[PDB]
Design a protein around this nucleic acid. Structure first.
Length: 178
RNA sequence: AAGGACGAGC
């Protein structure tokens, strides 16, 4: 478990929040190997966000299942840290409840996706996409969860073995565009 | 949406 699999961005922090209270707070779900509140170099004031890193991906998952999170009188806004290498890429920092899944071919059905994806989180809807004219399966689908974190969690692995296929998953982007 | 670490002349 490389650090980017165990690291959370924390947004919406009180400007009073320090590394200490961030650490105290998040250590109820485990050991932290790193913790920072980001500060303005000139004024030394909190920029309103920080990062925490747990020792195991188990602990991140327990923290994020354990939401919402309040610290210093504010509900904060945690999200899995997108790899630095990915900054500047299209949709890198997008936050969405909907997953694109491609490479599922013409034999994959709602239940195949429901079976595979349900232990990541609560699924609201599964859409297996068909041609409007033929009704043939187009080889891709979308899964919509009740929260963004299953999506964020799922896409840290690019390929998923679903119904005998090595499917690629991505954050669902708007049509719209795209 | 990045300070550190990974990797500062160790």
């Amino acid at each position: 478990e490389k650090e980017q699999f165990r690291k959370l961005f924390i947004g919406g922090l009180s400007f009073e929040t320090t590394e200490e209270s961030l650490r105290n707070y998040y250590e109820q779900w485990g050991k932290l190997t790193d913790c920072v509140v980001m500060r303005d170099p000139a004024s030394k004031r909190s920029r309103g966000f920080g990062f925490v890193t747990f020792s195991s991906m188990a602990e991140v998952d327990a923290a994020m299942a354990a939401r919402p999170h309040s610290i210093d009188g504010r509900v904060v806004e945690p999200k899995r840290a997108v790899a630095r290498e990915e900054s500047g890429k299209p949709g890198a920092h997008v936050t969405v409840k909907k997953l694109f899944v491609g490479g599922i071919k013409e034999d994959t059905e709602e239940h195949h996706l429901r079976d595979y994806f349900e232990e990541y989180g609560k699924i609201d809807t599964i859409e297996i996409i068909t041609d409007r004219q033929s009704g043939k399966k187009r080889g891709f689908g979308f899964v919509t969860f009740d929260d963004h974190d299953p999506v964020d969690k799922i896409v840290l692995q690019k390929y998923h073995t679903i119904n005998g296929h090595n499917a690629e998953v991505r954050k669902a982007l708007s049509r719209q565009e795209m």
